[PDB]
Amino acid sequence: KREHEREVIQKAIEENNNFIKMAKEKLAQKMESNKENREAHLAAMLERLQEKDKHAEEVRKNKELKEEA
């Protein structure tokens, strides 16, 4: 009975400890997955606006030929 009385209380610690563990992990994972996903969305936004900046130059550098002829 004494051996069992210890097994029970150590089982309660192990389970409450592991709840803390899982929670701490599941949180850290979805908080990192969020940071990556948002940074990516911003990266692709900035990407599109920077290819409009080089298309804008291909227009300013297309006219610069037409003018001189």
Added chain:
Amino acid sequence: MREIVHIQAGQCGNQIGAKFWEVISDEHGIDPTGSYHGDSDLQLERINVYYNEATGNKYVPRAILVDLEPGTMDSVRSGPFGQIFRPDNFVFGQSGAGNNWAKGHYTEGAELVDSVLDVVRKESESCDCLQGFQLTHSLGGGTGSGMGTLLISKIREEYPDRIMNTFSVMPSPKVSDTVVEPYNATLSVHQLVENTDETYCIDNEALYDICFRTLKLTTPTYGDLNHLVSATMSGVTTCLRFPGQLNADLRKLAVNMVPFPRLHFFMPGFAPLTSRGSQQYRALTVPELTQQMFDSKNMMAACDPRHGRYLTVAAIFRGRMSMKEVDEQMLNVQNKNSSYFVEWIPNNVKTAVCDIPPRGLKMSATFIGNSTAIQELFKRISEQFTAMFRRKAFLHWYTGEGMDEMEFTEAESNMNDLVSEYQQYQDA
């Protein structure tokens, strides 16, 4: 076989424990400060059974007060006899048990149990010859139920040759609306079958029905319920507290009352039934004490003794009366209702007569029956239990504290065995 160590655990335990000490103190002529002021000397003959002596010849109860919250014990300490108890024998925590057997038996209670056993040990060394221990507690809560049974299991380890006695208050939906009490009770019973020699089954279903039906109290209070318990406890221990011939110590009582090690769950009765408001101007006749003390209305266990058979009976009469007439009426019941007594235990009814009556009465009779009808009580709890357990309801409170479903199944299984064992000898 001289000194008894008393322990009271939890809310229910400390309330009835206190009331018990209130009563017998008055009977033994001990005042709240602990000095003696009584007439007869019968009061001081076996005073050493429940009390210690100190300087100034003050009498201190051999009692240990246990709880996991300070509530009830602060109230007891500011109660009537509050200052009588040994201040160091107050052992309480703060967390509480939350009516959870697991909290009381495995976690919150384990954190406190060692400190209690230190006070037990100190009292047990003061003993010239220790008989054993009597515990007072409920089986429906957490502290008294869970921590109480833990203390028993632990005490049996240090004192395996001593006698373990208990006043165990069985739960009833008529008194408590806490849904988990059947879990607590079933778990406790398992412990009690294994680790007690004597258990007085004080049923709150009985105490309520008695208060409401017989005593005509439309709104029974704990004080009303406890007045009955207090009266029963006084009577049941009378043979222990005053000079007598029968069942004069816990072991002798156990040998007379317990034909089989597991079947040690007694059915207490009392007469005349009294309320704190009742007048009781007219003392009862000896025949009246007898017809009532065997009447189901007077049983504190809420079982119909006509549904089973008496394995053993102890009957205690108090007050100045015709000891001649006591024997005739006692022999009358046995010979009238001979079918309800097992034939394979000859002369299973034993009687004692103490001259000093209980407080406020001239004539009183107390009943202690090892009836096989006690199974009805365990059957009741078993049904309340399975109703929930088949759907695994409310188990998360317990598994959260480290327990497992298997431990419930075993407790359920063992109490079902107890019921069947009580039935085995009922048809013998």
